[model samples]
Target: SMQEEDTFRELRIFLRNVTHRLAIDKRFRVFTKPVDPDEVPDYVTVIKQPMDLSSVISKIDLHKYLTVKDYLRDIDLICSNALEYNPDRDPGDRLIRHRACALRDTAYAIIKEELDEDFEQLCEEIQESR
Candidate 1:
């Protein structure tokens, strides 16, 4: 039980750090909040599950992420939605697409660097929980 509590705190701290870094990044400025449907009429329709840094933080606070995989998926989802909505051909879309790619890159880099052994253990626990 003590070990489980330690793992819980570690995971929460890890998630918080990742989100804090992302929120502080200048590149992630536009990605910090939900996209306004009025700004891009098709955005909400196009991206079924829209995700952003703020949403990630919210999920973390709510303890929605049971494993590193869950957190990783949401992080990737934010960029994936952008990449899908913003095609490479158009100038404006190309910029947004590039930014999304950059965000994904930074996100994974943080995950890879911040904590690894705990993440692996978390995955193992998840596997056993199923």
Candidate 2:
């Protein structure tokens, strides 16, 4: 647990330093704005604890960060705006919704309330500092 704590802190520091670059990267555009938090996940067993994230702190790997483009891609996959995924969602129509709420609600949703709040506050603080 101590080691996990150490790595967590390391990741936090890395997040702190590279936040500006992350915001500009375009890959993380979804997180730059308000994303409602989800209900706390339950029955979440510790499948695995990741410690290796600290090893690449300076050499950050951001290839997987979700962006507006990524959301657009998924929203495209969603096909319809209905809450139900009837016959399962398949990429049917291009996002004619574009940047509208139809796409905005699902595409831009990042279900991490605490982290989202922190991220939003951090960006605000960073901007205020400038």
Candidate 3:
């Protein structure tokens, strides 16, 4: 269990480095606040509230331009891969898993928006290059 946490921490670091490189190369501006260990659960709660992606899509008018089928396919892939690497643990561990996935997906969304590209591009690049 503890070992899983260590592994996840390393993965997070790697993701952060990749994001940093993308941000630098793309000249993208973003603001990130590190989540203190104790505050992670709270952050997750805030993110999951009204967790329906349709709401965001509708608000951004992305539903009209982007195919929901395509977007959800990408989300499924991201979630699946994240879960695959996730070590089996207790129910309490789900919170951490959820937060990690949410943070990752959020970053992808922000990058896609700023880069005017599909989120799948980032996922592909990360998967292939990283």
Poorly placed runs, candidate 1 (over 4 Å): none
lDDT of 3: 0.41
Per-residue lDDT over 81-106 for candidate 3, one digit per residue giving the tens place of the 0 to 100 score: 43544447866446546754664566
Cα-based TM-score, every candidate: 0.88, 0.23, 0.27
Q: Look at candidate 1 and tell me the lDDT of residue 126.
A: 57
Q: CA lDDT of each candidate?
A: 0.82, 0.34, 0.41
RMSD of each: 1.8, 15.7, 17.0
> Residue 80 lDDT in model 3?
49
Model 1 TM-score is 0.88
- The TM-score of candidate 3 is 0.27
Backbone N/Cα/C clashes per model: 0, 0, 0
lDDT of 1 by residue, 1-130 (tens): 6666577667878889888988898878889999988888888877899999999999988978767778889988988898888766979888888888898888788778767876668755954675
Ranking by TM-score: 1, 3, 2
Superposed Cα deviation of residue 80, candidate 1 (Å): 0.8
